[PDB]
Amino acid sequence: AQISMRLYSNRDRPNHLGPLALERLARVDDVVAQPARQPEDGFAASEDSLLGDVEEYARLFTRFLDGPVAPLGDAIPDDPARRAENLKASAYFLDASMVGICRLDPDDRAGDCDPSHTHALVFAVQFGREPEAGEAGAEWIRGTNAARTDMRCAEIAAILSGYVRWMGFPARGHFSGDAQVDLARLAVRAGLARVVDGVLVAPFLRRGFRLGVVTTGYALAADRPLAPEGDLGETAPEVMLGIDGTRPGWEDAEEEKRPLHMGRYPMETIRRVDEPTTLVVRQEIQRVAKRGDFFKRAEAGDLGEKAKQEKKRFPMKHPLALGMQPLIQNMVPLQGTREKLAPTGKGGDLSDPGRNAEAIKALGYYLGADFVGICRAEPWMYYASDEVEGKPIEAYHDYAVVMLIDQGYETMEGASGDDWISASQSMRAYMRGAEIAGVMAAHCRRMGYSARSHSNAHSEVIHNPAILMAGLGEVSRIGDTLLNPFIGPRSQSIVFTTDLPMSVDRPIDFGLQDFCNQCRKCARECPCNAISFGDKVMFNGYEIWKADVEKCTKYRVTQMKGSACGRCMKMCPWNREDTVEGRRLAELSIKVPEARAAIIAMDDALQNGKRNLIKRWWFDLEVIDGVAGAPRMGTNERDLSPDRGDKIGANQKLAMYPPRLQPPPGTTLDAVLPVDRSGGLAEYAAAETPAAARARLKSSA
Ligand code: B12
Ligand code: SF4
Ligand code: SF4
Ligand code: NA
Secondary structure, eight states: OOOOSBSSOOTTSOGGGOSSOGGGSOBOSOOOOOOOBOOOOSSOOOTTSTHHHHHHHHHHHHTTSSOOOOOOOSOSOOOHHHHHHHHHHHHHHTTOSEEEEEEOOTTTTTSSSOTTOOEEEEEEEEOOOOOOTTSTTHHHHTTOHHHHHHHHHHHHHHHHHHHHHHTTOOEEEEETTBOSSOHHHHHHHTTSOEEETTEEEOSSOTTOEEEEEEEESSOOOOOOOBOSSSOOSTTSHHHHHTTTSOOOTTHHHHHTTSOGGGOSSOGGGSOBOSSOSSOBOGGGOOOOOGGGSHHHHHHTTTTOHHHHHHTTTTTOOSHHHHHHHHHHHHTGGGSBOOSOOOOOSOSSOOOOHHHHHHHHHHHHHHHTOSEEEEEEOOGGGBOSBOSSSOOBOOOOOSEEEEEEEEOOHHHHHHSOSSSTTHHHHHHHHHHHHHHHHHHHHHHHHHTTOOEEEEOSSOOSBOHHHHHHHTTSOEEOTTSSOEEBTTTBTOEEEEEEEEOSOOOOOOOBOSSHHHHHTTOOHHHHHOTTOOSOSSOOEEETTEEEOOOOHHHHHHHHHHOSSSSSOOHHHHHSTTOOOSBHHHHHHHHHHHHOGGGHHHHHHHHHHTTTTOOOGGGOOSOOOEEETTEEESOSSOOOOOOOOOOOOTTHHHHOOOOOOOGGGSOOTTOOTTSOOOOOHHHHHHHHHSOOOHHHHHHHHHTTO
């Protein structure tokens, strides 16, 4: 039994308070400043180590600590208290461990800092868990924590400073690698740390931490420093049990009992199988032109004029997403190599693939992944041709390292799924995963093993079969999304392929096929009816619930009451809170088939998927012509929808686009292939049932 979960829900807790119970700490109005440095590692990092890679990505993010400042619109809220809450929530959303605000005095902006800056958003990121000595990959990680954590701080400072700049206010990010103000001094004044023997000590962050700061003239309500002496209250019973929905005081200690390479969720308790729960006929799977990605189809005109127009901006309507974009786009040149590499003898003992897998897994979790799985990168997982030159893509690497980034339950529980924070929920997981995989792929290359990552911005593999084969999800009704037994459908994946030899994981079986046969919630709640209410079909050689990717693409690119859409992730019953009750309801789903229908039905009865306005922390801002304003057309504020009735699965008719109905390999964005919807509808009426496939396959056995 895993006992580290929260006993208490955070459903009434606003996001600006964060996962720690900082409001229950002893505070005073001021404290006398005193010299102090940030926590540093206990050991130095060898040439076997990560260090050079996390320093490169910190240097990349440094490029975006300052930037162009948008014109001021008329929709930025005035209240410094609301601004504070929104910015603090923004920082926690990007996984700041601890956040605070303080006023800048003249002494701070007397340096290179812009002198119009009056306020500082201070935030700390806790050191990562490191492998114990003798565990695989320890020497990859030992002594890199300050730079790994500094990278993360530089990332968050870059995004948050750009978010404020896109709202019309000059803002500059600061971290150890590039600061114009005294970080430690502001960490104390903002109430994140105290000083002990000249080193910062923060409550709750027992592992050490590193700092980032965003200074700005954007006026904010300030916080107060910690009581400089004596017990702050960190172990009070309310904090220890986390009654307000916060991190239990025992969770750190319980966590450290598991090996780092196993992750935080108990995937070891999920049944493994040699073949996936759904049928995969490799000899019948054709490789798809990357020009068949319907975003690429929309870009090239295949879906009409409006989809073409909006393809570039649809996920970048919101200033927060616009803060992430420079990082997303400029990480692409660093994704890695396709040519074979000579082993360089760095990295310690790489002769045990079982140990290499553990080290890559430990490496992922250390860098902030939520799941890691390894499978082998089969040639049919690669696109046939790229979309820009049309040239063939090679199956150049042997293995795929697949990592899931949780999109975030609490933010989505306040959102509609298709409102102004949707694309920011995708894009956050997109850049965070691209970061992590860029760093790991780079470290594989340092060890002389070709490695290349595959981002939202540039992938040469299709993630979904790798998510399946790595045992991170099952085929779900949502269609082009796989569902994980602990975080449901609430994930964005990042992959990097490599030649580094690693033991592969096996597919998982947690009963989801039988569960989805009894559930229609995501299908019922989709704004454009893109999800199938019917049975699974055969599609390009594998069994799948085929969603209508044409309808979904047009909705995500074109709908004007939000930025993109991910509502089908919010509505699934497996989208649950990380509480004892939530894990138990998942356990029951997995272990007790006779209870699945009751859980499916009570998820609607208890009105799960209804919006929680406590959690609506973001501003509704649409950028139009480079200026952030109120939304032109409004804001999706959807709640639970009703029953399409008993016969919908027989009457819904969707379009599918297997390779036959796609642009052929070699086609480029320079060509236009209007989507053949009538053929896609007829195609899907004609699809083989998975049952017939198994019969037909059996006769050639
Ligand atoms: C463009 C795109 C979309 C498009 C169109 C996809 C399409 N079919 O053309 C629309 C615009 C449809 C889309 C929608 C969403 N998608 Co999207 N999509 C992409 C993207 C970038 C490319 C798809 C592609 O490469 N070519 C299109 C061709 C290959 O499609 P296809 O032949 O029909 O095959 C699809 C499936 O059959 C599956 N697949 C392919 N081969 C095999 C083999 C087996 C055995 C199985 C089981 C599945 C499988 O993968 C393809 C996904 O489109 C990928 C990122 C990536 N590199 O995979 C994600 C991605 C697949 N989608 C993702 C997500 C999260 C979404 C959304 C929920 C929105 C969001 N919050 O981001 C919705 C969900 C829609 C749904 N009903 O499932 C995630 C899925 C992660 C997961 N948990 O499985 C991905 C992997 C991005 C990521 N990095 O996490 N997006
Ligand atoms: S299938 Fe597409 S349009 Fe429908 S809810 Fe999911 S993301 Fe939104
Ligand atoms: S909403 Fe229901 S049918 Fe859809 S993926 Fe989730 S469990 Fe499966
Ligand atoms: Na739910």
